[PDB]
Structure 1
Amino acid sequence: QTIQPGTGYNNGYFYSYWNDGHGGVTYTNGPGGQFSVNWSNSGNFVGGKGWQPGTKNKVINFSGSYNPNGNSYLSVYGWSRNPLIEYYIVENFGTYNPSTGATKLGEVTSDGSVYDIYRTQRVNQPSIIGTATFYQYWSVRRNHRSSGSVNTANHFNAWAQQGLTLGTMDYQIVAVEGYFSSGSASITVS
């Protein structure tokens, strides 16, 4: 169904949908691992389906279409605790490469492309445990796509080799994020 922001389970998958209250986004849960997002002159939002908790060796499959017009990402997205880390495995994006200005910490080859690895810091920003300062880890795919398989262990192991360690996993979703943009997406996770 079409829903207001929140979290829960839908057809055996965890979902999360958040927005900043600006307007312009419609999130719909579909059957099984499916969700759709349609947005028009949105604010900031994130929505998707996956698992709570995630794991460090999940192979995540996703299939569908992703058509941003402006600033948006399509990623495997999640958190760890202790240490608190927000992470992204970015499969596709719109007008903005989210690694712009950020410190490159290596490369990893996985699932048919090279990914560039980055770390950034968020200072006194909202998090799963309240306002905090924490790092963000990124793998950014060079060859953009809207279907595929992501072997998360390849990323998490590469990160660890470079000194980017993860704690206890919290949620782990395939997410569409937007920042004051428009677009449509329909994705099925498994």
Structure 2
Amino acid sequence: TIQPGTGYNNGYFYSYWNDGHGGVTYTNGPGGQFSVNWSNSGEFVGGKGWQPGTKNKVINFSGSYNPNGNSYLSVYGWSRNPLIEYYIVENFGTYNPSTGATKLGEVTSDGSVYDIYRTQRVNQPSIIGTATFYQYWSVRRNHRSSGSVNTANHFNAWAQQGLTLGTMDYQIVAVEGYFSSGSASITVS
């Protein structure tokens, strides 16, 4: 299992972060593979992809995702100027991250309708330090742990709705958890 941080493994950018609570391990495997095992964790995010991402990447992912509690499996990334944290959520555990969020439309992509939302994080950690910034969400209605994500369909639908992205920073397939347990093994390409 590896130290929290970022870097490159077998051609892929990776990012692994946690809040120091304990109870989560992250491992890099061959190619685009990574695994996460967690048991009564704190908050964490780990996954593989690209730095920088693009606005027309077709991301493929496959494997297993078995959360027990609060967790997401998403295409996850950021833009700068404007600072935006975004998710294309393919599956989740006990909590739908759009709960209580304002719905900004729908988009159909890669075999499912997704509901679109915007939320705001206030004075929270970001790629540029503590900040207030928007989050954009596409939440897949039909949950899965393998498939293909045509990111352009999401980014274009967001743009149509007034949810504009700046310059892309990293873009990964991420397993996120908040004080939960689980296991996941995902291969990205």
* Cα distance between partner residues in 2 of 1:179 and 1:19: 10
Distance 1:180 1:132 in 2: 23
Instruction: Give the whole-Å Cα distance in 2 for the aligned partners of 1:58 and 1:143.
Output: 21
Shift of 1:20: 0.2
Measure, in 2, the Cα distance between the counterparts of 1:35 and 1:132: 29
Q: Deviations over 1:54-81 (max 9, x none)?
A: 0000000000000000000000000000
Deviations along 1:26-85, one digit per CA (max 9) or x if unpaired, are: 100000000000000000000000000000000000000000000000000000000000
* Corresponding position: 1:27 with 2:20: no
1:120 matched to 2:112: no
C-alpha distance in 1, partners of 2:125/2:19? 12
TM-score normalised by structure 1 residue count: 0.99
1:67-106 per-position Cα deviation (integer Å, ceiling 9, x unaligned) = 0000000000000000000000000000000000100000
**Per-residue CA distance 1:83-133 (angstroms, 9 max, x = gap):** 000000000000000000100000000000000000000111110001111
CA apart distance, 1:4: 1.3
CA deviation profile, 1:128-174 (whole Å, cap 9, x unmatched): 00111100000000000000000000000000000000000000000
- The number of equivalent residue pairs is 189
Matches of 1:113 and 1:146, distance apart in 2: 13
Q: Secondary structure at the match of 2:116?
A: strand
> What is the percent sequence identity of the aligned residues?
99
Residue 12 of structure 2 corresponds to which residue in structure 1? 13
For 1:67 and 1:57, locate their aligned partners in 2 and report how far apart those are by CA, in whole Å.
Answer: 29
Partner SS, residue 90 of structure 2: strand
CA distance, structure 2, for counterparts of residue 132 and residue 95 of structure 1 = 27
Counterpart in the other structure of 1:68: 67
User: What does 1:14-163 correspond to in 2, within 5 Å?
Assistant: 14-163=13-162
Distance in 2 (CA, whole Å) between partners of 1:94 and 1:157 is: 27
CA distance in 2, matches of 1:153, 1:89: 11
Q: Which runs of 5+ in 1 are unaligned?
A: none
Matches of 1:78 and 1:107, distance apart in 2: 20
Question: d(CA) in 1 for partners of 2:126 and 2:88?
Answer: 18
C-alpha distance in 2 between matches for 1:26 and 1:167: 32
Write the distance in 2 (CA, Å) between the matches of 1:85 and 1:16: 17
The residue matched to 1:154 in structure 2 has which SS?
Answer: helix
Query: In 1, distance between residues paired with 2:29 and 2:17?
Result: 17
